[PDB]
Amino acid sequence: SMTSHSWLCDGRLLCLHDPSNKNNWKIFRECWKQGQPVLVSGVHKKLKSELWKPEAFSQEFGDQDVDLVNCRNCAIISDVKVRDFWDGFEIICKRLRSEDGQPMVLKLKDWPPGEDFRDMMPTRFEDLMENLPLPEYTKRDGRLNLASRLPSYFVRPDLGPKMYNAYGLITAEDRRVGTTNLHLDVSDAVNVMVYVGIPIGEGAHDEEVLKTIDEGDADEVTKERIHDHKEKPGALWHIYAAKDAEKIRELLRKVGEEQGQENPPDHDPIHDQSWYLDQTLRKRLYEEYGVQGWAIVQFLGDAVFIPAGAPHQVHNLYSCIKVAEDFVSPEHVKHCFRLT
Numbered sequence: 091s092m093t094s095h096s097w098l099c100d101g102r103l104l105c106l107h108d109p110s111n112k113n114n115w116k117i118f119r120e121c122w123k124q125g126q127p128v129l130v131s132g133v134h135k136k137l138k139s140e141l142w143k144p145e146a147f148s149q150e151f152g153d154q155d156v157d158l159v160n161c162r163n164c165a166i167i168s169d170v171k172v173r174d175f176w177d178g179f180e181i182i183c184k185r186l187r188s189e190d191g192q193p194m195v196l197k198l199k200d201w202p203p204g205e206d207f208r209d210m211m212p213t214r215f216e217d218l219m220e221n222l223p224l225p226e227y228t229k230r231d232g233r234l235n236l237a238s239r240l241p242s243y244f245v246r247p248d249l250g251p252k253m254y255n256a257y258g259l260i261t262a263e264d265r266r267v268g269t270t271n272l273h274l275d276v277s278d279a280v281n282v283m284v285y286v287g288i289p290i291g292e293g294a295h296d297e298e299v300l301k302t303i304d305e306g307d308a309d310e311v312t313k314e315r316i317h318d319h320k321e322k323p324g325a326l327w328h329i330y331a332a333k334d335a336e337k338i339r340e341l342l343r344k345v346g347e348e349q350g351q352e353n354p355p356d357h358d359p360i361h362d363q364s365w366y367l368d369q370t371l372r373k374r375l376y377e378e379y380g381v382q383g384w385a386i387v388q389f390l391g392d393a394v395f396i397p398a399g400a401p402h403q404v405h406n407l408y409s410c411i412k413v414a415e416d417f418v419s420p421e422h423v424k425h426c427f428r429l430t
């Protein structure tokens with residue numbers, strides 16, 4: 091039967107079921123005030139599916155010049171056509187290959203560039219902004235979004251949204267690599283999974299996705315949702331409370347020193363965006379510093395709400411198109427203030 095909501099992460103994560111329910115705020119606001127992330131399912135059912143396909147991006151924008159990132163080694167592939175990314179999104183026999191002859195795992199960097207999403211793709215901009223959940227928080231002019239109402243004493247977010255496009259990680263060795271490394275933002279954000287590409291035939295890797303979820307830190311209800319099939323899993327997130335950010339910095343300074351890095355005692359390994367917490371490092375964080383996080387699998391149409399100041403990282407299980415909007419809720423405005 092239909093219900094308003096359910097819990098994941100052993101009761102520590104709110105999951106809202108109806109993205110356009112006018113009463114969502116009554117359930118959301120207490121979890122949000124406590125500094126928790128929140129998940130909202132079903133946003134894909136609200137969107138125009140034909141606007142969010144890889145083949146349409148390639149057809150409309152394919153002659154644009156872009157840079158890619160090789161996720162496995164952070165090498166930059168400079169000044170190639172955006173069709174070279176999109177045509178290999180799902181069809182592995184069309185993907186760029188490294189020197190070893192293997193298909194690469196690529197991220198499309200800064201596309202659309204800077205604040206250009208609305209100008210480059212006005213129909214996509216409308217379809218997304220009209221269907222975002224918790225619209226009093228997330229719309230540019232929502233009553234609980236302070237972004238347009240704050241003086242220069244506050245760091246203000248860029249004009250959005252921003253698109254995040256990358257292939258899925260494939261191999262056992264790939265399990266320890268991030269799509270987006272551990273970092274934090276001084277604004278709140280909502281991140282929507284608008285498309286998941288699961289390759290079939292020549293380069294299918296469904297076995298190692300299932301091994302990754304079964305051997306990892308996800309909850310039993312999350313593990314249930316994977317094994318049911320039915321919905322397409324996109325990306326594995328780890329999110330940490332803003333209050334735990336300095337303990338995470340302490341662990342990463344200690345690990346950097348063990349690995350013979352030479353860093354000043356005050357350097358900020360979260361701001362550097364150079365680390366992915368693999369299973370070893372997540373267990374050490376819990377055992378040695380007493381810090382627990384939230385392990386979240388973002389399926390097609392799931393919106394992840396990330397609180398300002400919360401360290402987070404992302405690992406794509408399959409090829410993903412994500413679209414994210416920054417906002418400034420009153421609950422977390424302290425994180426962007428420029429004094430004390």
Ligand SMILES: Cn1nc(-c2cccs2)cc1N
Nearest residue numbers: 288296316319320321322323
């Ligand atoms: C590999 N795989 N494929 C699926 C779906 C395909 C179409 C709907 S759901 C779910 C998983 N885990």
Ligand SMILES: [Cl-]
Nearest residue numbers: 125332399422
């Ligand atoms: Cl907070």
Ligand SMILES: [Cl-]
Nearest residue numbers: 211212213214
């Ligand atoms: Cl458009």
Ligand SMILES: [Cl-]
Nearest residue numbers: 115224225226
């Ligand atoms: Cl709302």
Ligand SMILES: [Cl-]
Nearest residue numbers: 269270271363
């Ligand atoms: Cl990154």
Ligand SMILES: [Mn+2]
Nearest residue numbers: 273274275402
């Ligand atoms: Mn982020």
